[PDB]
Amino acid sequence: IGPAALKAVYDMARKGARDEIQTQMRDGGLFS
Amino acid sequence: GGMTGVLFSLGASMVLGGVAQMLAPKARTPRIQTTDNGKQNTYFSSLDNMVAQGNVLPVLYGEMRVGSRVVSQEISTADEGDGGQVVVIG
Amino acid sequence: GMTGILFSLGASMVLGGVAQMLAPKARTPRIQTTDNGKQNTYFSSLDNMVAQGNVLPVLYGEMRVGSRVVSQEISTADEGDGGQVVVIG
Amino acid sequence: LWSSYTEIIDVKQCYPNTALVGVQVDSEQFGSQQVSRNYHLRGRILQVP
């Protein structure tokens, strides 16, 4: 089904972005 | 819609910043200047007169002698006079 | 073929403000504690600076303002601006 | 002899809810520079139970 897949991808692209934000600001990244 | 897939538990994802941070929200240190040398001023002390132009009026909560914000400064000639009639200038 | 996922974004832009959708808004400078409580202007420099780091500035009208000093030098003056009127005593 | 007399009116503008201190000093024994005023005051009246 469509909307279930869309909501799943949207919620999956949340913690990925959050982890990317957190790792890129730690020591030698771009500081978000 | 009956089920809620992708539970997506958050454990160390918030611990990674520190453990005391999730019990106490930490404090904000001021910015360090160079012309100030090494006097690390905080956000709750002021021992000098400030200027009250388009600024906020500070508040005080207990003890801790503070400066102020100057609103009017003026010099005039000191006239001779006391609380009475004794006005000897000899 | 088809071009799906348009994903209209009219709602997201307003989240930062609506007046910004027509005006980029003027930038504001930061506040230095050392410079008491004075507010720095972004388009005027009353103080006369030093000709080095500061880039050659530009003027656009009025504004009695300072400068960037290139050479300062103090010596001994002459007694008499010119002509034959050169009295001393 | 009589000399010029001056009629002076003070500030009628009162400050509604701001604490303030006015200080007048002869400022002769002080140096040519300004003088810093520091005051050792208590806190604010709170709504304590």
UniProtKB/Swiss-Prot annotation, chain A:
Compartmental location: Virion
Superkingdom of origin: Viruses
PTM characteristics: Cleaved into mature protein H* by an unidentified protease.
Disulfide links within the chain: none
Quaternary structure and interacting proteins, as annotated: Interacts with the tail initiator complex presumably through its C-terminus domain. Interacts with the tail assembly protein G. Interacts with the tail assembly protein GT.
Function: Serves as a ruler that controls the length of tail by stopping the tail tube polymerization and is probably released from the tail shaft during infection to facilitate DNA translocation into the host cell. Assembles into a multimeric linear form possibly stabilized by the covering tail assembly proteins G and GT. Its C-terminus fixes the tail tip complex (J, I, L, K), thereby forming the tail assembly initiator complex. Tail tube proteins polymerize around tape measure protein, displacing the tail assembly protein G and GT.
Family classification: Belongs to the Lambdavirus tape measure protein family.
Name of the protein this chain belongs to: Tape measure protein
Source organism of this protein record: Escherichia phage lambda
Curated annotation (Swiss-Prot), chain C:
Record family assignment: Belongs to the lambda-like tail tip protein I family.
Superkingdom as given in the UniProt entry: Viruses
Protein name: Tail tip assembly protein I
Localisation per UniProt entry: Host cytoplasm
Organism this protein belongs to: Escherichia phage lambda (Bacteriophage lambda)
Recorded coiled-coil stretches: none
Protein's job: Plays a role in distal tail tip complex assembly. The tail tip complex is assembled successively with three tail tip proteins J, one tail tip protein I, one tail tip protein L and one tail tip protein K. The tail tip complex interacts with tail measure protein to initiate tail tube assembly. The formation of the tail tip complex is completed by the addition of tail tip protein M, which is followed by tail tube polymerization. May be excluded form tail tip during maturation and would be absent from virions.
Swiss-Prot record, chain D:
Localization of this protein: Virion; Host cytoplasm
Organism: Escherichia phage lambda
Family of this protein: Belongs to the Caudoviricetes tip attachment protein J family.
Name the UniProt record assigns to this protein: Tip attachment protein J
Functional note: Attaches the virion to the host receptor LamB, inducing viral DNA ejection. During tail assembly, initiates distal tail tip assembly by interacting with gpI, gpL and gpK. During virus entry to host cell, binds strongly to host LamB in an irreversible attachment. The binding induces structural changes in the tail leading to viral DNA injection through LamB trimeric pore.
Known partners and oligomeric status: Interacts with host LamB.
Domain of life: Viruses
Shown residues within the full chain: 198 to 246 of 1132
